[PDB]
Structures are given as C-alpha cells and as structure tokens.
C-alpha cells in the first residue's frame, strides 16, 4: 500500500511525455493554407482583420499572464495647438 | 473541517480496497 500511495502521489506525471504528439507541426494539416501558393500569406493576412477582441471570451480567459490605466499616456512627438 | 474530512481510507492506504469495491465491466481484448 506504500507503493500504491506513491503511485497516487505520482499518478501519471512522467507518462505525459508521449502525449506530446500535438507538438508536431505539418504544413498539410491546415485545409486552406495550401489551396493557393500564396494562401499562406493570405491566411497570415486573413487574421490581421481579427484581434484579441474577436477572440472568444472563454478563449480570452485562457490568456492568463504567467487593463489600461487612465494616467499612462502613449508618447507623442507633435503634440497639438 | 475539510482538511480533516478529506483524510480517509485512500489517504490512509485503503485505496486499493476502495477500487475493489468499485466494479465495472470493460470490453477487454485480453
């Protein structure tokens, strides 16, 4: 039972190494990246219309740092007047 | 009291008996 408790503590820690099958990257996987020779550039420029706002709120919640404040302006050079 | 409530048989080492009390039928090839 001591080894059973040790297994429960460890569970399946070192068994996730094989589960890295999702890390492999292949060009042909994307459906629309290849239909034209420049479809890669089109899709890279297709998401320029999108931004963080267009992301789903739940997917935005997945963006966790490992809000603007009114008193931090972005610097300018010409000012106004 | 949740810190003391969580302490039970599986933490004490009776986990294997608990799994033995859980019965399930699989479609095993072997």
């Amino acid at each position: 039972r001591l080894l059973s408790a040790l297994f429960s503590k460890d569970n399946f820690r070192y068994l996730m190494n094989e589960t890295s099958d999702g890390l492999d990257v292949n060009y042909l996987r994307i459906p629309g990246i290849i239909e034209n020779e420049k479809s890669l550039g089109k899709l890279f420029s297709s998401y320029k219309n999108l931004a963080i706002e267009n992301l789903h709120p739940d997917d935005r919640l997945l963006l966790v740092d490992p809000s603007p404040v009114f008193f931090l302006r972005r610097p300018q050079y010409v000012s106004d007047g | 009291k949740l810190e003391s409530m969580v302490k039970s048989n599986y933490r004490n080492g009776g986990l294997d008996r608990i799994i033995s009390k859980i019965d399930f039928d699989f479609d095993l090839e072997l």
């Binding site: 070192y14 999702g22 492999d24 998401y47 490992p66 | 409530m5 969580v6 294997d16 608990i18 009390k21």
Partner: protein
Amino acid sequence: MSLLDQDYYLSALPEDKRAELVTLQLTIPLKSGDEVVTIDFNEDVDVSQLCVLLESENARPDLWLSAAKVFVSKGNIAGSQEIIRKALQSNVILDSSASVTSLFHNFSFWLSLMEYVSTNSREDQFLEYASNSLQASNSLDSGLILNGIGNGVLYAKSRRYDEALKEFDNLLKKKSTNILAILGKAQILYKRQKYSQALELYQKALTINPLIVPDPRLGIGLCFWHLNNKQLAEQAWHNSLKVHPQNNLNTKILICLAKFDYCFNESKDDDEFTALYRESLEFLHSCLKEDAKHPLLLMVLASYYFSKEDYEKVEKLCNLVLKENSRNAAFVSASHFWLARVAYHKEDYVQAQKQFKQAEDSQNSNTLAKLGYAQCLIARNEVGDATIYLEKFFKENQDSKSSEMMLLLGIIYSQSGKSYYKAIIFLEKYVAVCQEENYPILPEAYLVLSRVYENKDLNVALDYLMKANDILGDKANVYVLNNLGIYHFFRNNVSQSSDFFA
C-alpha cells in the same frame, strides 16, 4: 453568450475563408479550352485516373497540390506521393520555373514526414527521403521560407535543436507573423523543457490563429500542468475538443488523466472518491470504444485491474504493450513496474528487483520503480545494499519530494542509531511534506523521532509522543502511555504521570 465552437471562428473570418478553404470539390480546367471538370472528394477519387486526367489537361500545379493535400487528409500518403511524382512528370511543372518543382519537392518532404509520423517507424529511411527532397527544393528555389521551416523540422527530428533555433531566428528576422515558426520554436522550447518560454509562443500563436493545426491549446494545457493550473488546462482542452472534435483523442486522454488526478488528490470522502473514479473509468471506456489498442490506455487500465487483483490481465496488457511500443522506453518502464508489482504478491523478490531495475533503466524518471527496487532490497534483507542505493538516489535527487523515501531513510538510520541526525532531518522533511500535502502523518515517524530525541531532548520527544497520541486517538497503545508517564515522571509531573500510568 456567443457559442464557443468552430463556427464561432468561422463567422469571425470572412466568408471567403469559410467555405472555399474547406471545399471538397476541385475544379479542373480541361485542355480543350473553356471546358472544366469538377470532382468531389467525398466520392472515392482514384489517384491514377485523376493524375492521368490532370496530366492530359495540364492543369495548374495548385490543383495538383490541393488534390495531394486532400488525399493526405484521406490518409492516402502513397496516393499523395504518386500525385507529386506524376506532377513532376507533368508538362506544366517541366515547363514551369524551378520554384514549382521546389514546392512539390517540399510537399514530398511533408509526405515523408507524415509517413514517419503515422507509423513512428523506419525513421532513418523516411528522414533521408525527406532530406533529399528538401535539399532538391532548396537547390531549385532557396528563397522559399518553407524550405527553412523544413530544415528546422529536420534538425528537430534529429535533435539538432541549435540549428533549428537559428532557422527560426532567421524566420523571425524575416517576419514576426509566421505562425509555423512560432509553433516550431515553442515545440523546441518544450523539448528543451522551457515550458514558460514555449507558453508565451503558444499564447501568441493562439491569439494569431485560433484555428491553427496543430492545436496551441494542447501546449497551453501542458504548460498549465507544469504551472499547476490544471483546471485552466482542462478548460482549454475542452475548448480545443469543441473546436477539434475529430482526430484528437489525445485531448480526451489528457482530460481523463486530469480527472483521475483530481479524484486522487481532491476527493473529500470515500463516496465522492468512488463517484469520481467510476466517472473517470466510464469516460476512459467511452474513449476506448473508439480505440481499443492504444498502449497508454492499456497501461492506465493496468493500474485499475492491478487494484482489482486481476494480475493475469495486467500481465497480458503489459506484454502486449511491450510488443507494440518497445520503441517507447516509458511504456517498457511502466510494464516492468507493473510486472514487478504483480510479482510482489508472488514475492519473487529477485525477479521483482530485476523488473524494477529494468524499469529504471528503460526510463530513469520513474521514481516509483526505484522505490520498489529499494523495497525489494529490503525484502531480500539487503539492509546495507538498500541503504547505499537510497543514499545514492537521495544525493542525486536531494530536491525530489519523495516523502516515503525520506521516511524509509529515517527508519533505516534509526535502526543504525549512529546516523540519528540524518534520521531527524528526513523525518522532519517527511512531516513537512505531509503537512503541505494534507496527508495523514504516520505516528511511527513521531515514535522514531521521540526515540531519537530520548538521548537529545526529552521535551521534543515528549511533544512528538503527544502528537502521535493525538493522531492515534483511541488507537493509543500501552507503550505510548507508559512512555508518556515516564516522561512526565522525569518532568516531575506527578499528576500527569499518574494519569498516564492509570
């Protein structure tokens, strides 16, 4: 709120990227002129006939490569290779520039990569084929960044991580919007155990493309597992499954593993533990109804069936996994560990120790195998040998939180007697680890600590004995009460000593 699915990011994208990118029908102009032919990939498209028709009509190479990509989606890697070869035999590519031939060489490179990936075998042969195709592509057209990406992937497969990282640095110099470069860099960083550094790349790729394959959320969940935020990992994996409900059973496997871990480490009562464990078993079985030969699923089920005293079926599954996935050393280690655990009931101490050693040699990260090896050494009365092995493991892994290892070290040193100071250190470390883990502290460690402190500090020994008695409650024994009474007698606590003696 807005539904989180594939259709969400479909509607987010313009309709040009919605329907055209997923067309299953290919339009091919004919050589006769304005005549065209439309062939739906839903039907059984023959590779040879389609290639012959394309060669006769001399269609644009885009159609050839799109058909190759679709046949890749169909799994016809041989068919896609035939398409690429006959396209190289076609008049269009022969009369086109070397750029088209280089692009088709890179497509054949991707075909070799997929052939290796789908089998996880014949790695050298497919790697050489891919290298030759990529070298031909680079010679024909060296300005294509896809050739650089292929070079980096080739370096990663051969574990030439520095060269691949340099290639991705060059790609970042070219442009920072390259999603594939980000994915490759993050994969290398994860391979180099740079979980956080790969995590920023994962987040950037996900923000740039939520519909990119491979899924960044898999890496994000892996990082959350590395950062202990496994709840967010499970949530992101659920979102990925919503986006990718097909050909992504690995996400379901990870979800089942996370559920099992939560059941093990969070169940507040036996009934809740049973409910969660059975729910995890049912989900694992439901995933198994799709694939019944996945080695990791068999290895996971081996734990349950070992707990069910079904050692024979555990042996069957372990041997089957060893026969299939002997390439993966971790599965060999797990099977050896489970065989040793089974033989422990048979008390094949020599055989179990040999199996534990083989498990350690297969995968050194298996601490449980080494602990079983030490336990088998104890079984064979090898007190000194077990002590030497344990000291070696502790000195190599002083940062490892193996509480039971430290408890065993303390017990061994207490039996030795002269090493009482290491015994105190190890028992205190075990106590601290158990308190941090909210696990029941063994009163035997308290008794050993009190026995050691008898010759050093009667106060600390008495305090530890009181703590052990409080843990025991009604489980107090005659020796504990007698020692408490003697402690109070030496403390001149006549009343308390008399009460303990009574």
